């Protein structure tokens, strides 16, 4: 079988995208953030501490096909400190027509204040490799994993938009979706992440510095985090730009026409348009804007978040030896 489902930005800034997913019998529909940098399918549920709930929730006991996975428990924290935990159910999950039975659904007993305050995200969906699944004591399989048997092809594609909706496909690659050919590149799973290595970078119409950048493809992340000197290299091409401790990252006059950033993928070159890099005014009506490229020194890993991913059509090849395809859009 195959699957097609729309993904739409939760706001004006493209901070993240949510996709509708259908849980249980009869189908309860939640908008979860598809996250290729994690491996847990969890959502707000009837079990969640009420003062911590502001979200559409999953009610286990109103689903016929739901089953409690005895003694299993989960606890997760993400890159920004946010976290959540609860118990586990298995149940039927559907994405854009693709239906999986027995998928582990992690019921949230408690969630951190950031999740609480986001009314648009009802839960997350892990699309990273299963070794990062927090279910204890026996790790559960991700949606993709569970689905791989019945997929026409063991692949999923991310087609995120720039301030527009996009698509997540499972089982096939929509050739109409991109321009040129897809350049595949090796993936390391030692870190459980879709981890790869760019061939380099080019700022604006500047030269392509050939240098190896090990990062991850992380749909759950907004910005593009690269080493400090790359990033410096960027911003120095923008007159008004400077780093700001107060904002915590490079700021520049909103009226600035931003240079493109080019990253390597094999002999291929992906070009993020300048606009993608203007993220927004630091507060509504401000003269200063926040940069879409930032140093990853403090994080500890290079992260190709949504600002770089919406710039391309991305293929997540889930063959036994996984690959990553990149095509321009």
């Amino acid at each position: 079988s195959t699957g097609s489902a729309t993904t739409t930005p939760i706001d004006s800034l493209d901070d993240a995208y949510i996709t509708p997913v259908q849980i249980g019998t009869p189908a309860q529909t939640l908008n979860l953030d598809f996250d290729t940098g994690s491996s847990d399918l969890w959502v707000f549920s009837s079990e969640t501490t009420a003062s911590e709930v502001x979200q559409t929730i999953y009610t286990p006991s109103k689903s016929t096909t739901a089953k409690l996975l005895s003694g299993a428990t989960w606890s997760i924290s993400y890159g920004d400190g946010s976290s959540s935990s609860g118990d586990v159910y298995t149940d039927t999950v559907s994405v854009g027509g693709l239906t999986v039975t027995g998928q582990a659904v992690e019921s949230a007993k408690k969630v951190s204040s950031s999740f609480t305050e986001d009314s648009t995200i009802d839960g997350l969906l892990g699309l990273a490799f299963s070794t990062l699944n927090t279910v204890s004591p026996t790790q559960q399989k991700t949606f993709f994993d569970n689905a791989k048997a019945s997929l026409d092809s063991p692949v999923f594609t991310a087609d995120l938009g720039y301030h527009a909706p996009g698509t997540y496909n499972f089982g096939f690659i929509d050739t109409t979706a991109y321009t040129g050919s897809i350049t595949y590149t090796a993936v390391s799973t030692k870190q459980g992440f879709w981890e790869w290595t760019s061939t380099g970078y080019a700022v604006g119409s500047g030269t392509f510095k050939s240098t190896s950048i090990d990062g991850i493809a992380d749909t759950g992340t907004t910005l593009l985090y690269l080493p400090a000197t790359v990033v410096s290299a960027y911003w120095a091409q923008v007159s008004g730009a400077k780093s700001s401790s107060s904002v915590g990252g490079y700021v520049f006059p909103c009226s600035a026409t931003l240079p493109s950033f080019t990253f390597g993928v094999g002999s291929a070159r992906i070009v993020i348009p300048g606009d993608y890099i203007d993220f927004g005014p630091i507060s509504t009506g401000s003269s200063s804007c926040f940069g879409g490229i930032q140093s990853s020194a403090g994080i500890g890993i290079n992260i190709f978040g949504d600002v770089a991913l919406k710039a391309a059509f991305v293929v997540f090849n889930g063959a036994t030896t996984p690959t990553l395809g990149f095509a321009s859009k």
Binding site: D11, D15, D33, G79, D118, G220, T222, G305
Partner: peptide, 7 residues
């Protein structure tokens, strides 16, 4: 807002 999804 700003999201950074499991370190």
């Amino acid at each position: 807002p700003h999201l950074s999804x499991a370190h």
